[PDB]
Design an enzyme around this catalytic site. Structure first.
Site, PDB file in Angstrom:
ATOM      1  N   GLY C 191      59.755  40.482  13.351  1.00  0.00           N
ATOM      2  CA  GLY C 191      59.590  41.036  11.977  1.00  0.00           C
ATOM      3  C   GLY C 191      60.516  41.727  11.258  1.00  0.00           C
ATOM      4  O   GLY C 191      61.074  42.642  11.774  1.00  0.00           O
ATOM      5  N   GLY C 193      61.094  42.329   7.381  1.00  0.00           N
ATOM      6  CA  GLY C 193      60.599  42.085   5.806  1.00  0.00           C
ATOM      7  C   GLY C 193      59.097  42.509   5.651  1.00  0.00           C
ATOM      8  O   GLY C 193      58.866  42.942   4.676  1.00  0.00           O
ATOM      9  N   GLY C 195      56.946  44.438   6.764  1.00  0.00           N
ATOM     10  CA  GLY C 195      56.554  46.107   6.474  1.00  0.00           C
ATOM     11  C   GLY C 195      55.999  46.438   5.182  1.00  0.00           C
ATOM     12  O   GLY C 195      56.457  45.663   4.193  1.00  0.00           O
ATOM     13  N   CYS C 198      58.498  47.900   2.727  1.00  0.00           N
ATOM     14  CA  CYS C 198      59.791  47.110   2.813  1.00  0.00           C
ATOM     15  C   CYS C 198      59.945  46.275   1.223  1.00  0.00           C
ATOM     16  O   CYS C 198      59.144  45.655   0.950  1.00  0.00           O
ATOM     17  CB  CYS C 198      59.457  45.945   3.853  1.00  0.00           C
ATOM     18  SG  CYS C 198      60.816  44.910   3.818  1.00  0.00           S
ATOM     19  N   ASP C 237      55.459  43.168  14.720  1.00  0.00           N
ATOM     20  CA  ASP C 237      55.874  44.387  13.889  1.00  0.00           C
ATOM     21  C   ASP C 237      55.789  44.389  12.493  1.00  0.00           C
ATOM     22  O   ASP C 237      56.803  43.719  11.897  1.00  0.00           O
ATOM     23  CB  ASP C 237      57.259  45.074  14.388  1.00  0.00           C
ATOM     24  CG  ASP C 237      57.508  46.295  13.909  1.00  0.00           C
ATOM     25  OD1 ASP C 237      56.823  47.108  13.004  1.00  0.00           O
ATOM     26  OD2 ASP C 237      58.836  46.566  13.977  1.00  0.00           O
ATOM     27  N   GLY C 239      53.668  44.117   8.382  1.00  0.00           N
ATOM     28  CA  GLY C 239      53.021  42.992   7.692  1.00  0.00           C
ATOM     29  C   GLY C 239      51.618  42.937   7.872  1.00  0.00           C
ATOM     30  O   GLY C 239      50.886  42.183   7.569  1.00  0.00           O
ATOM     31  N   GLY C 260      52.999  51.117  11.175  1.00  0.00           N
ATOM     32  CA  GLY C 260      53.546  52.111  10.612  1.00  0.00           C
ATOM     33  C   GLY C 260      52.369  52.704   9.704  1.00  0.00           C
ATOM     34  O   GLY C 260      51.905  53.824  10.101  1.00  0.00           O
ATOM     35  N   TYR C 284      54.581  59.244   3.653  1.00  0.00           N
ATOM     36  CA  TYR C 284      55.094  58.030   4.212  1.00  0.00           C
ATOM     37  C   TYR C 284      56.498  57.263   3.908  1.00  0.00           C
ATOM     38  O   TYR C 284      56.464  57.097   2.560  1.00  0.00           O
ATOM     39  CB  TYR C 284      54.049  56.952   4.392  1.00  0.00           C
ATOM     40  CG  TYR C 284      54.270  55.733   5.148  1.00  0.00           C
ATOM     41  CD1 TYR C 284      54.489  55.636   6.658  1.00  0.00           C
ATOM     42  CD2 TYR C 284      54.694  54.530   4.686  1.00  0.00           C
ATOM     43  CE1 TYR C 284      54.971  54.797   7.317  1.00  0.00           C
ATOM     44  CE2 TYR C 284      54.960  53.357   5.382  1.00  0.00           C
ATOM     45  CZ  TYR C 284      54.965  53.526   6.550  1.00  0.00           C
ATOM     46  OH  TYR C 284      55.408  52.405   7.571  1.00  0.00           O
TER      47      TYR C 284
HETATM   48  O1  LIG Z   1      61.958  47.214   4.860  1.00  0.00           O
HETATM   49  C1  LIG Z   1      61.617  48.077   5.528  1.00  0.00           C
HETATM   50  N1  LIG Z   1      62.174  49.391   5.200  1.00  0.00           N
HETATM   51  C2  LIG Z   1      62.295  50.647   5.859  1.00  0.00           C
HETATM   52  O2  LIG Z   1      62.675  51.803   5.609  1.00  0.00           O
HETATM   53  C3  LIG Z   1      61.611  50.671   7.120  1.00  0.00           C
HETATM   54  N2  LIG Z   1      61.450  51.507   8.076  1.00  0.00           N
HETATM   55  C4  LIG Z   1      60.516  50.754   9.050  1.00  0.00           C
HETATM   56  N3  LIG Z   1      60.392  49.389   8.793  1.00  0.00           N
HETATM   57  C5  LIG Z   1      59.565  48.438   9.409  1.00  0.00           C
HETATM   58  O3  LIG Z   1      58.406  48.538   9.201  1.00  0.00           O
HETATM   59  C6  LIG Z   1      57.593  48.544  10.286  1.00  0.00           C
HETATM   60  C7  LIG Z   1      56.199  49.431   9.671  1.00  0.00           C
HETATM   61  O4  LIG Z   1      55.218  48.492   8.771  1.00  0.00           O
HETATM   62  P1  LIG Z   1      54.162  49.011   8.132  1.00  0.00           P
HETATM   63  O5  LIG Z   1      54.012  49.995   7.384  1.00  0.00           O
HETATM   64  O6  LIG Z   1      53.737  47.737   7.413  1.00  0.00           O
HETATM   65  O7  LIG Z   1      53.203  48.810   9.385  1.00  0.00           O
HETATM   66  C8  LIG Z   1      58.447  49.415  11.276  1.00  0.00           C
HETATM   67  O8  LIG Z   1      57.792  49.274  12.787  1.00  0.00           O
HETATM   68  C9  LIG Z   1      59.630  48.771  10.973  1.00  0.00           C
HETATM   69  O9  LIG Z   1      59.895  47.260  11.830  1.00  0.00           O
HETATM   70  C10 LIG Z   1      60.955  49.195   7.489  1.00  0.00           C
HETATM   71  N4  LIG Z   1      61.193  48.076   6.887  1.00  0.00           N
HETATM   72  C1  LIG Z   2      65.444  50.394  12.081  1.00  0.00           C
HETATM   73  O1  LIG Z   2      64.011  50.429  11.560  1.00  0.00           O
HETATM   74  C2  LIG Z   2      64.108  49.081  10.880  1.00  0.00           C
HETATM   75  C3  LIG Z   2      63.365  48.043  11.170  1.00  0.00           C
HETATM   76  C4  LIG Z   2      62.813  47.985  12.874  1.00  0.00           C
HETATM   77  C5  LIG Z   2      63.173  46.816  10.460  1.00  0.00           C
HETATM   78  C6  LIG Z   2      63.493  46.707   9.093  1.00  0.00           C
HETATM   79  C7  LIG Z   2      64.341  47.993   8.510  1.00  0.00           C
HETATM   80  O2  LIG Z   2      64.855  48.107   7.063  1.00  0.00           O
HETATM   81  C8  LIG Z   2      64.554  49.207   9.276  1.00  0.00           C
HETATM   82  C9  LIG Z   2      64.985  50.418   8.685  1.00  0.00           C
HETATM   83  C10 LIG Z   2      66.379  50.399   8.534  1.00  0.00           C
HETATM   84  C11 LIG Z   2      67.597  51.241   9.203  1.00  0.00           C
HETATM   85  C12 LIG Z   2      67.026  52.558   9.671  1.00  0.00           C
HETATM   86  C13 LIG Z   2      68.994  50.826   8.764  1.00  0.00           C
HETATM   87  C14 LIG Z   2      69.635  50.611  10.000  1.00  0.00           C
HETATM   88  C15 LIG Z   2      69.506  48.925  10.231  1.00  0.00           C
HETATM   89  O3  LIG Z   2      69.641  48.362   9.515  1.00  0.00           O
HETATM   90  O4  LIG Z   2      68.827  48.631  11.499  1.00  0.00           O
HETATM   91  C16 LIG Z   2      63.219  45.466   8.656  1.00  0.00           C
HETATM   92  O5  LIG Z   2      63.372  45.146   7.296  1.00  0.00           O
HETATM   93  O6  LIG Z   2      62.703  44.952   9.643  1.00  0.00           O
HETATM   94  C17 LIG Z   2      62.512  45.804  10.718  1.00  0.00           C
END
Ligand SMILES: O=c1[nH]c(=O)c2[nH+]cn([C@@H]3O[C@H](COP(=O)(O)O)[C@@H](O)[C@H]3O)c2[nH]1
Ligand SMILES: COc1c(C)c2c(c(O)c1C/C=C(\C)CCC(=O)O)C(=O)OC2
Ligand SMILES: O=c1[nH]c(=O)c2[nH+]cn([C@@H]3O[C@H](COP(=O)(O)O)[C@@H](O)[C@H]3O)c2[nH]1
Ligand SMILES: O=c1[nH]c(=O)c2[nH+]cn([C@@H]3O[C@H](COP(=O)(O)O)[C@@H](O)[C@H]3O)c2[nH]1
Ligand SMILES: O=c1[nH]c(=O)c2[nH+]cn([C@@H]3O[C@H](COP(=O)(O)O)[C@@H](O)[C@H]3O)c2[nH]1
Ligand SMILES: COc1c(C)c2c(c(O)c1C/C=C(\C)CCC(=O)O)C(=O)OC2
Ligand SMILES: COc1c(C)c2c(c(O)c1C/C=C(\C)CCC(=O)O)C(=O)OC2
Ligand SMILES: COc1c(C)c2c(c(O)c1C/C=C(\C)CCC(=O)O)C(=O)OC2
Ligand SMILES: [K+]
Ligand SMILES: [K+]
Ligand SMILES: [K+]
Ligand SMILES: [K+]
Lengths: 351, 351, 351, 351
Positions: C191, C193, C195, C198, C237, C239, C260, C284
């Site tokens: 996964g 994008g 999220g 995201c 993970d 979506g 998340g 969140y």
């Molecule tokens: O585009 C993103 N920007 C962020 O800041 C970010 N932080 C987390 N993640 C990722 O999203 C997952 C959680 O997604 P959900 O809230 O959709 O369950 C998490 O398990 C990660 O894979 C991010 N993706």
């Molecule tokens: C690390 O946590 C994530 C994960 C798992 C995903 C995404 C994301 O943006 C972050 C936060 C991005 C951070 C903390 C910047 C460092 C990095 O680039 O790893 C996503 O788009 O798909 C999966």
């Protein structure tokens, strides 16, 4: 009539799938150089941009200040030709003699600058532009698949040989690219309809999704290189809405990108900064609008874009994201990105 | 039941990709003539429009003034048949004897005019129309794939031979076209559902995207020409929303275009000019609305269209854009456009 | 560049078609156990979740209370690593020593807990996590197709052999999965994008519809199992928008799901409960937001999610629906669902 | 898991392309009779509806008055089984003994009536229904691809042989149809998710576009007929939004149609007529709503539908449109429509 097996697509319909990122790929080590004009196999281009961005041949975008500001960062501007021959030459001259980093300069340390020309008054305009010191020219048109561009390029080659570089366009398919290549263009511009100030529908109904256009022209260009040994750089002009569209355009094969709206937002664009209800904006109008042609219909629009400040900080932020994405794709250079990028189409629903 | 391999599409889903534009192609040199009625190979049509536009067989569109105004520009109007036989004949007679440029006239310099007929009272209506001087007739129906149209055309051929021209329709596929061709139609009208005042869904659920319909009928028509040597002109009726849709309809093979809404906006349409909150509008209702049939459901709607002024200026602006686009496609004539046009489908997201 | 034959799709574009439901399939008899870490053919995983849900490696989701609350229901939490090594270890230790049902515990009856790690300070962080009693680790990254993850896993294997379990990711295709598998990952996270927090577009433009990503990785994983006899559990993970997306993710081959937003809504998440105009919400924010990195752009967003109460009642309601749907598909276990599920894509219009 | 080559579609994505309309096809001559229960080749069904419409097995739709009103027009109602066995029997008895045109009656001139049954209390409910005089029964379920339906039908066949008719469902594919056919169903009901009061997504995530479901089941049914000589009538249940959807459902192969919302709007439905701000409405709730089951989640919704008056006038207007469309397709009967209909899919953009 002739039809196609697949519908055309825009940059918004694509995403990049990551490749293997090696330890040596960090943004700071990414090389964004790219060829501006054609060359033969085994050679290098006589002109290489430090960054793959060029500002549009528009009254509301590429003036003297824009050209200097962009050249300083490694790109180049094409001073708009929709003005008197003497006015355009003055701007070109002012840029070349401004000094009287990743700066783009000639062997005399002078900033590089481009100039747009048309298929009508080129016999008088070109000489003035050359005399003024323009480093490269470009025929500015909505449909470059024209005998007029062939005639214009031919006249330039007959009087200056290969000493004067001239780009041509715009076209959107392999046939159009091929016609301009055989005609002698030093670089070919891709794009009809993609622009922001473009209302294709409420116009002539000609055009093609920018992504499909670039992908098709790039394949023809590569085919052309294999047949003749001549590599012609192509420019993806218009249709760039987000920073990642830049990475996509390059990954699909475009050597450099031409932008209008993007640069119009900067302090250095030649338009008026206007404050509308607490928001500082900048004027922006297409070359097809009546507001520009005047130098019952309309090929473009006249609107406002949000002020983004100085060009430097914005271009740096944009290219840092491009560099970062390139490392996600396992690329340290643009050619490597064009070779290794994994590009997927996205479903309608996803959007 | 029978299904299809591809879904149908409307004009809004297509764009034209430019071809080679030669120096001799300028709007002023573009020829917009087109055949109205069928002819054999090696011959020319007995009636050729100067412009490929005809006004719809509707009470709110084609009256006496519309017919004169359009004929003056080179097109032709089909006086609505949803009125008394004597009222329709009077209008036809008034047009033919108005004189008692690109004007469309007969050997007597009189404006050409058409008249709609139905499959019910044709034995009394046709003679009156012929006697009044109608140059061409057309059976007006939502589903022309009917034995009734065959009977109507047959009766006309038995009493007038090939001296009286009669168009038939509407149909949307090769089978329907073929049936009306063998029946003797002089031209076949394409289109069910495309119209502006058409709510296909909230009706019978019959129809087909106009583009798909035209493309399919045109292929059958060309196949028919090869087998029999008979060229039957086809008319794309309805579904035209923007000027570029006209170019698309022609490029896809339609010889001419029938429009309702487009012409209803003009001063010359027979409806009331109404001012609604600062905006001058014109009445417009479909022939299927209860408002028209009266001469618990409803095949059409009754609405307003924005006033556009006189027909002349609007048609000129529309056709100048068509001519310009044709040159982008490397065409100086409609047949050349139909032969050289490069037409691409556009993705859902692009729209 | 490399292209694909089909566009990618999200979970919202799919529906499950029922299979034969036998008399013995009732929700209460559905077994939701699933493997967490890799094992060889003929063996069982050393760690099996009681329910296929794990909470995200995020500051606003997986704290001490979340880990205890989720373990009590049979799932596991991955304590966020975006904090000091000593702070993370304390949380892990607090969970392992909380006791100083479908609960997920070790041979000492202590709740299981996971911990996220990064590719930078792992030489100091891992030992602290192991010493604190973490049952499993997971490298947290937006693009796991990196040599850095290979290096990190390799270091762990050199100092702890196969005694320390470490998941890797994220990846979205067979190549990325394959690279992490050969590198030694105990489970691979899918996964990029998908999220909720995201905004892929307004970022780097990298990613892939979650459904397409899972389906592709699962096929590679099954191919990998056949070649080497090693079964690597994969985690879908992000979506997940609706409960039925859980069933879809599992049916497509994912062994477990990481969420998340879903868990952030619970009383047990470590964020502030805020009352906004009569509505109780929870904070969140993504790990990519500046709000989290601080421990001109932004990889994530900072928003609010509606308060849903305690984790227990919500997870139970969610899994009862999953179990019920599984019986509709003729499945009493996850492996049986992955084998028998009939999954159809839905048209754009249907949505 | 098992996937499909094409996404599923709803009725709104289709249109009918006209066929040859003969002089003898006028609405008044269209025969809308259709078989209700299975029969062998060469025979006729023991029960034929005069019109292909049946009212849904719902508390808010099929009561005593609805059954009488619909039978009078030629259709049949299935008295809801979500009530006490004695209450349902009373309604059935009241309909059969109401008399103590296109009316649907038995050899005693008594109105025909159906009754829904479940897979739980059928041993007590069936006998009561038979004794009360129910002409046909139907197992009411969201997923009829169940061993429970096989058991229920089997029990009925063991105690009543082929004297008691029982329909089964719902299913959405050939496998589900096949299972219920071999089980002995007299007619099979198609549809999961299509309903108006259906929020498939926010439920279990099971279902299929109604059009795709009908087309697939019909092909299996025809295949089944060829192999065994047994013709099993199928019912398209739910997903009917407009009158033309009825014609589509029949053209695709459905013998009859089951509607809930459509009939709930009538004076004869058993719900309360409520006036909301000048608009008279009728209550309507799904059998899956808590409001109905009571005889933390919810399979259906509770809403309002606009009052349409008496059933008679509305059904007549609806079927007149169906008959008219049938003539456009060259069909005088439903079987002829199913054989001759030309059905095309419509592009996303067209909608
Ligand atoms: O585009 C993103 N920007 C962020 O800041 C970010 N932080 C987390 N993640 C990722 O999203 C997952 C959680 O997604 P959900 O809230 O959709 O369950 C998490 O398990 C990660 O894979 C991010 N993706
Ligand atoms: C690390 O946590 C994530 C994960 C798992 C995903 C995404 C994301 O943006 C972050 C936060 C991005 C951070 C903390 C910047 C460092 C990095 O680039 O790893 C996503 O788009 O798909 C999966
Ligand atoms: O439809 C159009 N009407 C106009 O008036 C117009 N003016 C310029 N251009 C073209 O658009 C490009 C700039 O586009 P962006 O603002 O999207 O970067 C430019 O580089 C040109 O290719 C026009 N297109
Ligand atoms: O659905 C319809 N209901 C009506 O009441 C109706 N009246 C006319 N027509 C047909 O529409 C054509 C005119 O369409 P435009 O306004 O789109 O040009 C006309 O030329 C006709 O083909 C109707 N279609
Ligand atoms: O998702 C659903 N939730 C419910 O609560 C429900 N109740 C009934 N049904 C089914 O819907 C059919 C009636 O649909 P219409 O109102 O669309 O005609 C009915 O005939 C049934 O097949 C339900 N579907
Ligand atoms: C010339 O600048 C452009 C370019 C490059 C493009 C378009 C366009 O409209 C204009 C303005 C159109 C003008 C000034 C009218 C003259 C002409 O037709 O060339 C477009 O659609 O694709 C590319
Ligand atoms: C006849 O004029 C039309 C035409 C040409 C079309 C349509 C239509 O609705 C009407 C009005 C419908 C009327 C007057 C009812 C009689 C009939 O059914 O012919 C349409 O959908 O495609 C083409
Ligand atoms: C039984 O009535 C239905 C039918 C026929 C369908 C659906 C549905 O939700 C209900 C109500 C669901 C109920 C009463 C819960 C019991 C069950 O699950 O059978 C649907 O989605 O497709 C068809
Ligand atoms: K990578
Ligand atoms: K051209
Ligand atoms: K089932
Ligand atoms: K017909």
């Amino acid at each position: 009539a002739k039809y196609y097996n697949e519908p055309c697509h825009t940059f918004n319909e694509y995403l990049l799938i990551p490749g293997l990122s090696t330890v040596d790929c960090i943004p700071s080590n990414v090389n964004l150089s790219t060829p501006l004009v054609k060359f033969q196999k085994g050679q290098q281009s006589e002109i290489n941009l430090k960054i793959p961005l060029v500002s549009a041949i528009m009254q509301s975008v590429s003036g003297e200040k824009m050209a200097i500001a962009l050249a300083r960062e490694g790109g180049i501007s094409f001073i708009f030709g929709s003005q008197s021959i003497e006015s355009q030459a003055a701007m070109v001259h002012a840029v070349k003699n401004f000094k009287a980093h990743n700066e783009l300069v000639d062997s005399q340390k002078r900033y590089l600058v481009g100039a747009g020309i048309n298929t009508r008054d080129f016999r008088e305009r070109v000489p003035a532009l050359v005399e003024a010191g323009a480093d490269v020219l470009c025929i500015d048109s909505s449909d470059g698949f024209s005998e007029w561009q062939k005639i214009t390029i031919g006249w330039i080659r007959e009087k200056y040989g290969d000493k004067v570089k001239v780009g041509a366009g715009n076209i959107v398919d392999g046939e159009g690219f091929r016609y301009l290549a055989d005609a002698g263009a030093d670089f070919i511009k891709i794009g009809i309809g993609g622009g922001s100030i473009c209302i294709t529908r409420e116009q002539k109904g000609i055009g093609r999704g920018q992504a499909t256009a670039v992908i098709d022209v790039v394949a023809e260009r590569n085919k052309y290189f294999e047949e003749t040994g001549i590599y012609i750089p192509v420019c993806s002009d218009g249709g760039i809405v987000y920073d990642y569209h830049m990475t996509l355009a390059l990954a699909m094969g475009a050597d450099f990108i031409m932008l209008g709206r993007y640069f119009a937002r900067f302090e250095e664009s030649p338009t008026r900064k206007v404050t509308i209800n607490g928001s500082v904006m900048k004027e922006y109008w297409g070359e097809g609008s009546s507001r520009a042609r005047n130098w019952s219909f309309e090929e473009g629009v006249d609107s406002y874009v949000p002020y983004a400040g100085k060009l430097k900080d914005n271009v740096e932020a944009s290219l840092n994201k491009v560099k970062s994405t390139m490392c996600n794709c396992g690329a340290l250079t643009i050619p490597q990105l064009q070779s290794k990028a994994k590009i997927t189409l996205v479903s309608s629903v996803s959007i």
